[PDB]
Every structure is written in structure tokens, then in C-alpha cells.
Write a protein that binds this DNA or RNA. Structure first.
Lengths: 114, 31, 98, 93, 57, 54, 48, 97, 48, 55, 64, 48
RNA sequence: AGCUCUCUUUGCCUUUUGGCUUAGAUCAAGUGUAGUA
């Protein structure tokens, strides 16, 4: 059947109706605009090269901060030392762009599907 | 007679059989 | 209105008014069509062909002049030259090669 | 009766039903057939009627592969069957 | 090659096998003949086979 | 153009080979499918025409 | 896993019935509303 | 926007049907590779099937947390969520095999 | 700007295959089983 | 010239774009129009001489 | 009756349309060379009929 | 029927130019250096 | 070396599948006899 259909021509916006007002639609709320006070920044433009210098100084400061520069009881046991290198996970937390193979999905699906 | 038939049906025979069994104006007012 | 730049619709409306001998109507349509869609070669071809089949060789020349104003592809200049070679004004075809 | 062996009528009706409904609606296909369930129709397509199934006599190369794999993976026939190139019942028999 | 349309080539292969071959290679040639004959059992190849069979008579 | 339309209708009205459709839209779609996909599904086609391996 | 048994000379009532149903359901394309709208179109033409 | 100029654009909702089938093949872990579908169109379809899939998986994670906590009482949410995690488990298990 | 000079190679390069669904059939079509099994990559997958 | 023309016609039957089909259709229509009546054209041109030298 | 149900199969696995086409094509391969003969002599005799008509007209114009 | 089969065999011939598994010839048990050895030994014999 | 008609091949696709989700969900079924006439 073709009762159930896609959209190939989505609905188009209309201008407002130029009619007499009787209907109530939007109750007033937050009718006062806040402005950036002195100290809240924004209302001060200095130049371009000063901004570039400040940006590069902040980047150099962050890189400086990151760098830091100013009978034995276990002898009949069949297998010994099976857990070397297992605790070494956590060298650097790494992002994989696959939500089916990310570590979050594996943790989630091992927690829940028991 | 449970001997095998000389002709055996195919699905295209089913599809073929499915296919096989599938004003004057007097005045201006009628126009 | 719904499909302004559709060449098939334009040709259908022009031919629907040409089959009923509404020549002035269809020439208005063709001017509007090649005004709306100046880089569609089919509309220009249809306008030059309609003007040549009606016997108005100066009309065909003025339509070709507007098209050449629009700087078309090679086939349009070739068609204009073949027109002037068909009718024998070889100096005019020389100007068109210039 | 909801059982039996597959006849030619049922195989042709199954193939036409699969042509109309596809390989993911076995309940419609099984509604066409009076004696067969959706699982039996699915098993008949997967084990017999699939056009990737080789019904010719075996080669010696396939025999060598089959015996080699049956020695590798004992009684793991559904594992061996994709590697050999036939179905599991074909390799078993 | 088709066995039921090109029999002379298979006759030449059997002649080469009886001059140079064994029972194992002969069984291999039977196996290849049966496999190829089974492969060419299409409708169009059956039509061609019957067409040439009634054409040579 | 009307003669071309009638000739196309008459040519497609003639059937040749097996019937794999149930109405005329299905026949047109199946012929379009053939025109695009025969060059990719030859082996499956002969698997049906043969009764065995691809 | 066995090849299909060939068809007998005389088929059962089960077999002939399932062939009749197979033809009927193979020829089918429409749901309820489409069939009803086609029947309504024919009926409205008859009434007109 | 990625079709060239002058190509006959008569059949382009066909791509949307391809996207629908590609999504269904993603859910059922069936590989999707249409013979003869161009690489640009295939790239668009694969890109948006990845995006839809990520939205699906995130919604499954969120509803599973809410079902664990008892924050929801609707039966439809639980049924949808068990269906999604059944599919996700079977995808992971096919990968494991 | 003047229209792009296409070739028949480009027109063939932008042909969109007719889609054959493994799940859907809103017109109740009977599709050949060759075309239904055309986009199933599972048979053409590798095993090793 | 005729054989090169017909090889060009054979090679230009697959669709490239609508500009080329417009070109082909126009050339076919002009060819099917026939050779022009140049005597009628010369008569009309002479009448245009006499009218344009009357205005 | 085999025209209507010609898409069914035999016991071996051959379609009735296939064997009917095979028989018809075998007959055509038997009969095709003699048809291309009889058409070549047919057009040949038509050509001599033309040459006889034109020798008749030229002798009619030469004798008056 | 003949013309339809002619079209079918044209398509079969189109298939026939692509299904060719290439002839993987075995390595010969003798190499061309030993062939040249046989050539010059036979030349020595015939010259003697 | 033309123009008509006819046929073939090439082009063309021209009635040529119009969304979604937990494949949206689910799906066993009346009775079939009959020593003797």
C-alpha cells in the first residue's frame, strides 16, 4: 500500500497571520535581557596581534605545565605465572571511533549480558 | 496410480498460472 | 510556479501552444523560457528552429544574435554559421567566425 | 499431519513462495505448505534448495580437504562444512 | 570443451592416455569428463547439443 | 511518438522464456532487474538452470 | 537433505488444494483498503 | 549535491531504499555490498548507517541503565531494549566466532 | 556557468541499481531468485 | 566524408548530456527541413530592399 | 496441451519449452541451407524477370 | 526460436570471453641451458 | 550516396517496488465410517 509514505516535499514555513488578537499563546517570561558587566568580559576588543600574542602565551604556558619544566606449597600447580602483563593495561586511555568495539561497549555488554 | 508423473511441475508454471487467471454525452450538462 | 527551471515543462507548454497555432503566445513563451534559462541549449535551439520554420529569417537572426550575446558553446556558433551558409550571406558568416 | 518427506510439489511451491516473500519470512512460506513448519521450510532451503549447494559427485581434492579437516576438528561438522564447500549433512554422509 | 559436442578431442585425450598414462590418470580423466558433462547440463547447451546431433544426421 | 509507444507496448507484450512475474509492473521491474544484474548473477543463473553448484 | 520425490500420476486432494491456494496467494498483491477502493471505484462507476 | 550536473536524476529515491536495506543489514549482521552501486553513493550510505547505528547504540545504553534502576515502568521500553541488546550480543558473538 | 561536458562513461558511472530487499516487498512482487540472492555477500565471503 | 559522418553518428547514439541531444535533434530537424527555397528568399530580400528604401 | 504447460519439467530435469525449442531449432538447422538456396534462386529468377521485361520494352521501342 | 537462441548464444559467447581460468603450465623438468647442451652435443655428434 | 515501407542491431526504461520500530507483534487442530444383503 501507499498509505504509509516518505516525505519528499517537507512542509514550508508560513508568515504569521495578520489577524485580531484574542488567543493567548506565549506567557511572558525572562523579559529582561542581561548584559555582560565589566568583569564578565566580551565588551572589550583590543586588537588582533595582541590577541594572537596572548593566545600563543597561553598555549606555551599549558605546554610548559604539561612538560613540567619551570616442600614449596605451590609446586604441584600445573601453570605458573599466568598474569604477567595483564595489569599493564592503562598506558594511555585511547578513543576508538567504533561504539561496537569501544571499551565502553565491552564493559557494558559484559556487565549486563550474564 | 503412484507411479511418477511424466510431467513434473515447476514454480514458473505456478507463476504462469497465477498470471493467466489474474460513454456518450447527450447535452452540455452531462459534459 | 512549482517547477520554474524545468526544461521539459517549458517545452511541453511551448509545444502545446504551437500545436494550436497560437504563434504570438508561443513566442512570448519562448522569450520567457530563454530569459529564465539562458544556458539551456535546447530552448534556444527550439526558438531558432521555430523562427526558421515560420519563414522569419530576420527573426531567426535576431534570436541567434541574442544567443551569441550569451556566449554559448561551439555547436551554437556552428549552427548560426550553417544558417548563414544555407542562405548565402557569406560575409555575415565571416563576421560570425570573427 | 504436520510431517513427512519433501515432495516435488512442496519444493516448487517453496521456491515460488521464497521468490515472492524472500528468505526472512518463513511463516508466510510455511503457510503455503500444508505439512511443513517454518523451521522445516527454512531447513529445506538451507540444506537442499540453496543455489550454492553442490549436488555433483565429489572430487578427490574435496575428499582430501574433508578428511584433513575431520581429523583437525573432531565431530565439529558445522565448522567443517563452510570450509569444505558443502553442507554439514553432505560432509557427514 | 563439451563431451557431447566435441567427442574427437576426448578421443584424442584417451589416445594420449593409453599411449602415455596409467589407471590413476585414466580415472582422473573420467572424473574430469563426468564433472564437465555435469557442468554443461544447462538448457541452452542441451539445445545446442540436440541441434548439432540432429544436424549431423 | 504514438507509433513508438504502441510498438513498445506490443513488443513488451510478447513473452519469451519463463514467467517470473505476476502483473505488468512486476514484469517491467523484473526486466529492469535483468538488464542491470545479469552481468553479476550469471553463476547463480546457471546454478538454477543446472540443478547444482554455482 | 534428500532429493524431492517425484509427483504421482493422480495427486491428493491435499496437493490439489495446496496448488489452488498457491496460485491464489501468488497472484495476490493488495491489502484490504486497496481492494476496497478498487471495488468502490467499480461500484461508483456502475451507480453513475 | 554530489551527483554531477547533467546526470539523469530520475531515480534517486532508490538510494533511500538502499539506505533502508543497509540499515537492516547492519542490524542483522549481514554484510551489505550491492553489486554495481557506485562508490560515492555507497560512501554516503555507509556514513549515515554508521551515524544511525551510533544513535541506536547510545539509546540502548541509556534505556538499559534506566531499566536497571527501575526508573521506567513502560513495557514497550523494556521489550525494545531486550531486542536491541539481543542483537548487540549476537553481533559480538558472531565477531567472537 | 556553461554546462559540464559529460560522457557515456560518466552516465554509466552514476547508474543506481534497482533495489531488491531481503525483507520488504510493498507491491507483492515476485522477484527472480537470482536477483534476490544478488546482494547477499555471505555466500561470497571468505572462509579460512 | 560520408563514412566518417556515419561513424560519428554511430558513436554518438549513447546519451551524454542534454546539450548534445539538443544539438543532434536540431541538426536532424534542419536536415529534414530540406534545402531552402533560395528564390523565395531572394524575392523577399528584394522586397525588403524596396521597402527599406521606401522608409 | 504442452504449449500451455511448457514451462514444467521432465523426469531427467529438462523443461518442455527447452525440448520443444531444441526440436524446432534442429529442424531449422536442417532446413536453413536449402531455404537460403531457394531464396537466392528466387531473387535470381526475379532479376531475370526484370531483365526480360526491360528487353521487351527496348525491343518495343526499337521496332516501333 | 532460432533468432531467440541466436541472442542467447551471443550472450553465452559474451560470457565465454571471461570464464577462462588461465592455463597454469607446470614448470618443465628440463631448462633451456640443458636444451642447449643437447643441441651442442648433437652438433658435435653430427659434425663428427 | 535519394525518398517511402519492412526487418535487424544500438540507444532509450518511457505503468520500471514512496517512511518508521521490539524481522513492529503473533499464528496447532473438527469428524471420514462401512461382518452380513
Amino acid at each position: 500500500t501507499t498509505a504509509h509514505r516518505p516525505t519528499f516535499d517537507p512542509a514550508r514555513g508560513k508568515e504569521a497571520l495578520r489577524g485580531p488578537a484574542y488567543h493567548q499563546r506565549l506567557l511572558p517570561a525572562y523579559t529582561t535581557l542581561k548584559f555582560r558587566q565589566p568583569g564578565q568580559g566580551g565588551a572589550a576588543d583590543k586588537s588582533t596581534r595582541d590577541l594572537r600574542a596572548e593566545l600563543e602565551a597561553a598555549e606555551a604556558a599549558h605546554y610548559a605545565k604539561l612538560k613540567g619544566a619551570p616442600r614449596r606449597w605451590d609446586e604441584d600447580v600445573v601453570f605458573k605465572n599466568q598474569a604477567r602483563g595483564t595489569e599493564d593495561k592503562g598506558k594511555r586511555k585511547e578513543f576508538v571511533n567504533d561504539l561496537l568495539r569501544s571499551d565502553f561497549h565491552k564493559r557494558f555488554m559484559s556487565k549486563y549480558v550474564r | 496410480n503412484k507411479a511418477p508423473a511424466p510431467i513434473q511441475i515447476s514454480a514458473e508454471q505456478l507463476l504462469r498460472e497465477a498470471v493467466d487467471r489474474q460513454q456518450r454525452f447527450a447535452d452540455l450538462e452531462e459534459l | 510556479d512549482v517547477h520554474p527551471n524545468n526544461t521539459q515543462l517549458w517545452i511541453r507548454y511551448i509545444e502545446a501552444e504551437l500545436k494550436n497555432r497560437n504563434i504570438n503566445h508561443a513566442r512570448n513563451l519562448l522569450d520567457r523560457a530563454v530569459t529564465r534559462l539562458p544556458r539551456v541549449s535546447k530552448l534556444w535551439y527550439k526558438y531558432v528552429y521555430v523562427m526558421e520554420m515560420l519563414g522569419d529569417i530576420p527573426g531567426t537572426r535576431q534570436v541567434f544574435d541574442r544567443w551569441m550575446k550569451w556566449e554559448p558553446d561551439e555547436d551554437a556558433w556552428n549552427a548560426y554559421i550553417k544558417l548563414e551558409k544555407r542562405y548565402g550571406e557569406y560575409e555575415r558568416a565571416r563576421q560570425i567566425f570573427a | 499431519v504436520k510431517g513427512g518427506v519433501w515432495t516435488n510439489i512442496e519444493d516448487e511451491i517453496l521456491k515460488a513462495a521464497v521468490s515472492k516473500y524472500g528468505l526472512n519470512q518463513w511463516a508466510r512460506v510455511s503457510s503455503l505448505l500444508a505439512r511443513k513448519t517454518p523451521k522445516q521450510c527454512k531447513a529445506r532451503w538451507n540444506e537442499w534448495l540453496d543455489p550454492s549447494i553442490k549436488k555433483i559427485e565429489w572430487s578427490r581434492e574435496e575428499d582430501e580437504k574433508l578428511l584433513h579437516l575431520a581429523k583437525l576438528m573432531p565431530t565439529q561438522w558445522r565448522t567443517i562444512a563452510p570450509i569444505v564447500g558443502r553442507t554439514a549433512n553432505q560432509c557427514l554422509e | 570443451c563439451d563431451p557431447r559436442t566435441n567427442p574427437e578431442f576426448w578421443a584424442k585425450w584417451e589416445q594420449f592416455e593409453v599411449q602415455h598414462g596409467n589407471e590413476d590418470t585414466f580415472k582422473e580423466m573420467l572424473r574430469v569428463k563426468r564433472s564437465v558433462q555435469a557442468k554443461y547440463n544447462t538448457d541452452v547447451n542441451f539445445i545446442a547439443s540436440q541441434a548439432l546431433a540432429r544436424s549431423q544426421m | 511518438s504514438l507509433k513508438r509507444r504502441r510498438e513498445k507496448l506490443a513488443k513488451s507484450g510478447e513473452e519469451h522464456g519463463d514467467v517470473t512475474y505476476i502483473n505488468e509492473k512486476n514484469k517491467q521491474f523484473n526486466a529492469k532487474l535483468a538488464r542491470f544484474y545479469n552481468k553479476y548473477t550469471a553463476e547463480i543463473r546457471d546454478s538454477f538452470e543446472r540443478g547444482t553448484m554455482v | 537433505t534428500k532429493p524431492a520425490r517425484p509427483d504421482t500420476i493422480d495427486l491428493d486432494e491435499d496437493e490439489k488444494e495446496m496448488l489452488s491456494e498457491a496460485r491464489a496467494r501468488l497472484a495476490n498483491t493488495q491489502g484490504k483498503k486497496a481492494k476496497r477502493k478498487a471495488r468502490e471505484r467499480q461500484q461508483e462507476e456502475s451507480r453513475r | 549535491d554530489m551527483m554531477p550536473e547533467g546526470i539523469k536524476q530520475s531515480k534517486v529515491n532508490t538510494v533511500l531504499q538502499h539506505l533502508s536495506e543497509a540499515w537492516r543489514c547492519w542490524k542483522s549482521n549481514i554484510p551489505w555490498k550491492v553489486p554495481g552501486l557506485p562508490a560515492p553513493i555507497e560512501n554516503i550510505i555507509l556514513r549515515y548507517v554508521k551515524a544511525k547505528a551510533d544513535w541506536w547504540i547510545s539509546v540502548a545504553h541509556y534505556n538499559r541503565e534506566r531499566i536497571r534502576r527501575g526508573a521506567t515502568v513502560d513495557k514497550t521500553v523494556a521489550k525494545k531494549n531486550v531486542g536491541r541488546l539481543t542483537r548487540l550480543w549476537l553481533k559480538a558473538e558472531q565477531e567472537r566466532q | 556557468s556553461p554546462p559540464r561536458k559529460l560522457t557515456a562513461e560518466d552516465q554509466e558511472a552514476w547508474r543506481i541499481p534497482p533495489p531488491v530487499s531481503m525483507w520488504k516487498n510493498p507491491k507483492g512482487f515476485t522477484i527472480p531468485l537470482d536477483k534476490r540472492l544478488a546482494a547477499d555477500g555471505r555466500q561470497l565471503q571468505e572462509v579460512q | 566524408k560520408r563514412m566518417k559522418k556515419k561513424e560519428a553518428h554511430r558513436d554518438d547514439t549513447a546519451f551524454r548530456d542534454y546539450a548534445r541531444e539538443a544539438e543532434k535533434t536540431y541538426k536532424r530537424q534542419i536536415r529534414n527541413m530540406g534545402a531552402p527555397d533560395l528564390e523565395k528568399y531572394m524575392r523577399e530580400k528584394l522586397s525588403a530592399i524596396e521597402k527599406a528604401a521606401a522608409a | 496441451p504442452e504449449e500451455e504447460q511448457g514451462s514444467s519439467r521432465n523426469l531427467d530435469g529438462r523443461r518442455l519449452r527447452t525440448v520443444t525449442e531444441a526440436k524446432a531449432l534442429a529442424e531449422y538447422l536442417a532446413i536453413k541451407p536449402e531455404m537460403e538456396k531457394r531464396e537466392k534462386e528466387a531473387r535470381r529468377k526475379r532479376w531475370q524477370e526484370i531483365i526480360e521485361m526491360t528487353e521487351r520494352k527496348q525491343e518495343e521501342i526499337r521496332n516501333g | 526460436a532460432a533468432l531467440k537462441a541466436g541472442q542467447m548464444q551471443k550472450l553465452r559467447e559474451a560470457e565465454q570471453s571471461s570464464k577462462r581460468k588461465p592455463l597454469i603450465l607446470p614448470a618443465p623438468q628440463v631448462s633451456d641451458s640443458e636444451l642447449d647442451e643437447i643441441v651442442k652435443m648433437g652438433m658435435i655428434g653430427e659434425r663428427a
